[PDB]
Amino acid sequence: QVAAERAARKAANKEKRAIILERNAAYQKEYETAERNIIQAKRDAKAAGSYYVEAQHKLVFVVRIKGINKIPPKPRKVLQLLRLTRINSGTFVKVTKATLELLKLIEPYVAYGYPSYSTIRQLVYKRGFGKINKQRVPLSDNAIIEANLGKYGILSIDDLIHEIITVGPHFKQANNFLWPFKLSNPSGGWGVPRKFKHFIQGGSFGNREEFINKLVKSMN
Amino acid sequence: AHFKEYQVIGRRLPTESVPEPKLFRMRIFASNEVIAKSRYWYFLQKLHKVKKASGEIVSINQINEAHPTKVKNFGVWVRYDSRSGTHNMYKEIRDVSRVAAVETLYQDMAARHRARFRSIHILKVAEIEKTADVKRQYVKQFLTKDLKFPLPHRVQKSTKTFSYKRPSTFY
Amino acid sequence: VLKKNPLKNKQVLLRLNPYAKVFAAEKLGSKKAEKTGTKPAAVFTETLKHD
Amino acid sequence: GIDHTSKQHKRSGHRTAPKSDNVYLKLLVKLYTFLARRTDAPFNKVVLKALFLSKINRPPVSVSRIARALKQEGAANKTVVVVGTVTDDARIFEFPKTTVAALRFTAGARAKIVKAGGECITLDQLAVRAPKGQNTLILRGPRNSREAVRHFGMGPHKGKAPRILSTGRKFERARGRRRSKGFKV
Amino acid sequence: GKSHGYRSRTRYMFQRDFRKHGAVHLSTYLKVYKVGDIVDIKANGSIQKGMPHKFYQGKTGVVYNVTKSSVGVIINKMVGNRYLEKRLNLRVEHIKHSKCRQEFLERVKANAAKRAEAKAQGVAVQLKRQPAQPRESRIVSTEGNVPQTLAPVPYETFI
Amino acid sequence: AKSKNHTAHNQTRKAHRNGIKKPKTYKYPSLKGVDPKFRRNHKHALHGTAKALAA
RNA sequence: GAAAUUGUUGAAAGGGAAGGGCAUUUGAUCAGACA
RNA sequence: GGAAUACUGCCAGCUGGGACUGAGGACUGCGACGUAAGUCAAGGAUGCUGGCAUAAUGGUUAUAUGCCGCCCGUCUUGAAA
RNA sequence: AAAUAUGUAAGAAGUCCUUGUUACUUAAUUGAACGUGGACAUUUGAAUGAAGAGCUUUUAGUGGGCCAUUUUUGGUAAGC
RNA sequence: GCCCUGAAAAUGGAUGGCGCUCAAGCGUGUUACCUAUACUCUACCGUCAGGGUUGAUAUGAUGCCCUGACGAGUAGGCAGG
Ligand SMILES: [Cl-]
Ligand SMILES: [Cl-]
Ligand SMILES: [Mg+2]
Ligand SMILES: [Mg+2]
Ligand SMILES: [Mg+2]
Ligand SMILES: [Mg+2]
Ligand SMILES: [Mg+2]
Ligand SMILES: [Mg+2]
Ligand SMILES: [Mg+2]
Ligand SMILES: [Mg+2]
Ligand SMILES: [Mg+2]
Ligand SMILES: [Mg+2]
Ligand SMILES: [Mg+2]
Ligand SMILES: [Mg+2]
Ligand SMILES: [Mg+2]
Ligand SMILES: [Mg+2]
Secondary structure, three states, X not given: OOOHHHHHHHHXXXXXXXXXXXXXXXXXXXXXXXXXXXXHHHHHHHHOOOEEEOOOOOEEEEEEOOOOOOOOHHHHHHHHHXXXXXXXXXXXXXXXXXXXXXXXXXXXXXXXXXOOHHHHHHXXXXXXXXXXXXXXXXXXXXXXXXXXXXXXXXXXXXXXXXHHHOOOOOHHXXXXXXXXXXXXXXXXXXXXXXXXXXXXXXXXXXXXXXXXXXXXXXXX | OOOEEEEEEEEEOOOOOOOOOOOEEEEEEEOOHHHHHHHHHHHHOOOOOOOOOOEEEEEEEEEOOOOOOOOEEEEEEEEEEOOOOEEEEXXXXXXXXXXXXXXXXXXXXXXXXXXXXXXXXXXEEEEOOOOOOOOOHHHHOOOOOOOXXXXXXXXXXXXXXXXXXXXXXXX | OOOOOOOOOHXXXXXXXXXXXXXXXXXXXXXXXXXXXXXXXXXXXXXXXXO | OOOOOOOOOOOOOOOXXXXXXXXXXXXXXXXXXXXXXXXXXXXXXXXXXXXXXXXXXXXXXXXXXXXXXXXOOOOOOOEEEEEEEEEOOOOOOOOOOOEEEEEEEOHHHHHHHHHOOOEEEOHHHHHHHOOOOOOEEEOOOOOOOOOOHHHOOOOOOOOOOOOOOOOOOOOOOOOEEOOOOOOEO | OOOOOOOOOOOOOOOOOOOOOOOOXXXXXXXXXXXXXXXXXXXXOOOOOOOXXXXXXXXXXXXXXXXXXXXXXXXXXXXXXXXXXXXXXXEHHHEEEOOOOHHHHHXXXXXXXXXXXXXXXXXXXXXXXXXXXXXXXXXXXXXXXXXXXXXXXXXXXXX | OOOOOXXXXXXXXXHHHHOOEOOOOOXXXXXXXXXXXXXXXXXXXXXXXXXHHHO
16 A cells, blocks of 8 residues: 555546636636626616616625624624624625624624625635634645535635635535634724724724725735 | 715616606715715705615716816805804815815815814805906905015925024025 | 745645646736727716716 | 633533542443444443443342333343443342343342343443444433432422421421411412 | 502503494404414403403413413513413403414415425425525616706705 | 612623523423313323224 | 841942832852763 | 826736744655656755853842832722821 | 514424314314324525533522713702 | 903912923814734643544553633632642
C-alpha cells in the first residue's frame, strides 16, 4: 500500500479540481452576463422614453455596532436570533417580509446594506469559518466544505460564495454553516462624530444600502 | 455636507383598479442618494395620500449644472420654523452653480437665524436672468461696471514659531 | 496551525480556486466592454432638465 | 463583551466514571471503555454508562423477572445481562435454562440458576463471548418502588405519603384529613 | 378598602353592543360542538348563568366535555413562571366556533389535491407557504404619463 | 416607620430565568370532569371491543 | 532570648504628613553558563 | 459634432518604506512550477556575521523623576466621612 | 375608535376510504366515543435561531431597597 | 438671531485653571489627528465541551495527546490545594 492507493487518491484529486475549474468558469460568465444585461436594460428603457425599475435587493449584510449593555428585551432577542452577540459581528440575511420586520426592531443597534460580489468574496476568503460539530473551523481547504455541504451540491469555496450572492434553494443551509463573521473596527474610522444616530441624520445605524461595502471592507 | 441635486420620480403601487398610476417628480438637494430618497417621501407625504410602504421609486438621477463656470444671480424662496412660528423668506445668492448657492443658503440660515437643516424647506431656486430684477442691496453692489477693490491689511501665515523681523501687512 | 490569508499568499490562492490561474492570464479583471450607441429619447432629456 | 445565550463553563451533569474506589470495577470500566471506542456497537456504550450508576440507580433484578423476560416471543435463547445484583425469588417454581451475566449473584440466585442447568458468568466473560453484544437482553429493576420515592412531591391533593415516624390513630388523621374536622386536604 | 369582587372592573366588557340588546338569535343554540373543537370565549351580558370569569374573555380553548346546555373548555393559564390547565363550564351563548383553523383545514385539503395532481407529471410539488418576496424588475412607460413636478408649499394660516 | 407597599419590579426577569414552561401535551388526556353517563357506557364499549380483537 | 519600644555606629532622603502602583535612571548588592 | 477630465466602483495588476510576532519540532496533507529527475514562499524561521564571557544583560534593594493612589473593619439605598 | 401590548392555529397525537364494540343516544345502525384493516414521507405543510432536549431530589442566602427615560396619582412645590 | 436693560446677600473664588475678542465665544459644514480592561490577530494560564490512543521491551489510561469556545462579581453554594 505504498504506491497503489496513493496513486488512486491523487487521480481522484485531479478529477475533483477539474470539476471545480469548470464550475468557476461557468460562474464567471454568469456574473458577467447578468451585470451587462442590467446595464443594457437601463439604456434600452431610456432610449424608448421609459424607466427601467431594477428588482429589489434579495440579500443584506448586517453588522452590529452597539455594545451588550442596556438593551431592551425584544431587540435583544432579535439580535440573538440573527447570531449577532457581540459588537462588530456580521451575518448575511435573506430579504423577505418575515425578515424585514426583524430589521426594523433592531435599527438603532446595527448597520446594514446591500453587499457586492467583491465584498462577499473577501469576507469568505479572509474571515470565513465553518461550524463543524459545534466548532469554529477555518475554511483553509475545499475538502472540509465538500464534507459538510456536499449533499447540497456545494463542493468548493466559490460554490459557497455563489449560493450566497445568488440566493439559491440551499441558502439557509449554506448561510447557517458559516460562523458569524468577527470584524474589527474600521481602519479609517466611522466617518462621523457620533455613530448612534441614523445614517440619514449623519449617524451610523440603519440601512445605508450600497454604502455598506465601503464600511465592511475597512472593517475586514 | 457638499450637496448634490437629484431628480426623484415616484408612483403609487399599481393595482388592478388603477394600473399605471401617475408619476410625480421633484428636485432634491442632498449629499447622497440614500438621503435624497428619504427626503422625497418626506415631501410627498405632505402633498398626497401615499407613503413608502404603499409606493415605489421609479428613477433617481443626478442633475449637473449646465454652465458650471458662469457667474449667476440666484433667487431663493425658503420656508423655515423658528423657535416660535413658521415664516417665509426670500434671499438672493451669487454663485456659479445651484448646489453652491444652496450650500451658502444653509450656512446663512444657521448663522443668522440659528435654523438647522431639519427646520428648512427649499421652496424654489431660480436664476435671475436680468439685471435690475435683483432686489437686495448686498448683491447689487457687485453688479457695477469695472468693479475694483483692494485687500487692506494682509496677514501672512508663518510656518515657524519665531520670526527675526517685524512683519508687514502691505498688499 | 496557522491560518494564511488568500489574495495575499498566492500559493494558498491557487490551492483553493484553480480558476485563479486562468483569471490572471486573460486579464479578466480589466475586460473591455463592447461599445454601444443607444441615445435617450427626447422625453427623458426634457424631464431631467425640467424645473 | 459577549451576550451569552447560555450559562458558561457548565458541566455535562452525567457521570463519566464510577464514584467507587473498587479496583475490580475500574478494570471492567477500562475493558468496556476500549470496547465502546472501537466497536461502534450500541450495546457496549449502554453497558459502560450503566457501570457508572449509583446504588439507587441499579435496583436488584430477581430471577422471576428474568424468567418472565425469557417468555417473550423469540427471546428464549438470549443472554440476560444485568449490570447490578441478581436476587433470588421463591415465589416462582419453574426456571428455564438460560445464561445470565451480572455483576453480582446472591447465594440463592446462583443456586437456582445452576440447579436448572444454566450458568452464571461475569461481564468480562460476556465480552469474550459477545464483543458486540450479540443475542443479549438488558434488564433493569424498578426505580420508583423505592421507599423514599413515595414521599416526593408531597402537597395538597397530591396523594403522597407524609414523612412520619409513628403511624396510628393519633398521628396525622385529624383536621386536614377529614371533612368532620375542618376540611379534607 | 379595596374591592375585588367576581365581576369587578367589567363595566364595559360585559355590555351589549349598540342597538344589539334583547334576545339571542336562534342560530346560537343550533350549532353543534364536539370534543376536540376549538372555541373562543366571549361572555354575553344578558345571560347570567354559565358566565365565564373576566380573565377568560377573548381566550381560545379546546372542548373536552359536552352537557345538556353547556360545554367544557380547557384553557392554559400562566401562573407565576409556568402555565396551568384550567377547565371551564360555559353555556353555549358565551362561545362560538373559532375560525383560526377553518381556513387551515382547506389548505390541508388543497395540499392533498395538489400533491396527487402533480404525482403523475412533475416532482417537487411545492406545497409550502412563502412570505412576501421582493418585487421583480419592471418597465414604467411615460406614454400619457409624463411626470409632474411638485414643490413644497409656503406657510399659510387660513384660520 | 413607613415602608414600600407593593411593586412588580424585577418579577418578570425572575420568571424568565428558568420559567415560562409551555405545558406538555400527553396522548390520552385524563377523563376528569367528563359526564358520568358517557363514562359508564364508554367503559362497557371498551370492554366489548377487547373481546372482539382477543377472540 | 522574638515583637512593641530604645541607645550607639553606618548608609540614604526630607519647601504644610508619611506610606503605595506601573516604568526606567543612579548607587549598593547578588545567583545562573563558561562545555 | 468629437474627445478629455472630475466623481464613484472593480482588478485572482505591479512595486517601495516602517513596526510587532517566530507558537510547533522525524515523516504523513492540499497545492505550485517542471518532458522528466526534482524543486518551492505549499499543515508556524532560518541563513550569515560581530562584540563580550562579566556584574555587561538581568534579579533584589534604596533613592530620584512622570503619571496615578482618601482608612481599614462594620451596619446601610448610600462611608474618606 | 387607534398605536403599543394580548389569546389561538400553521399536521404522523395529520388527513382520507372501508367497517367493529356499547348498558349512552336516535322514529331508525341515527349519532357519539374508542378501535380493526387500507392509502399518503420528511419543500411532511411559513421565517429565523437552537453550547441538545426532557425530568427529579435536596439545600444556602434574601423577604429595609434605591436611581434614570417614558406613562402616572396626591401636593404650590421638594434631592417629597 | 446675537448683545444689552430688567438682574439684590452675607470668609476670598472659580466656563476645572490660566487665559481668550475676523476667539481659544455662538450656529453650521468638510477632513486630519489623540486614546479604554471594548473590537481584530498572535502567545501563555485556567475552565468547560467534543475526540484520538493498552501493543510489548521504559516508568504516571486519575496518563499522554488533538480540536473548539469561554474567563466581572457582594450575600451564598460547590471543588482542588
Ligand atoms: Cl451604556
Ligand atoms: Cl424596586
Ligand atoms: Mg491613523
Ligand atoms: Mg466619535
Ligand atoms: Mg342565581
Ligand atoms: Mg418591605
Ligand atoms: Mg538568658
Ligand atoms: Mg525590636
Ligand atoms: Mg540593568
Ligand atoms: Mg490624585
Ligand atoms: Mg441611614
Ligand atoms: Mg467604610
Ligand atoms: Mg431585616
Ligand atoms: Mg465652530
Ligand atoms: Mg482592549
Ligand atoms: Mg469569576
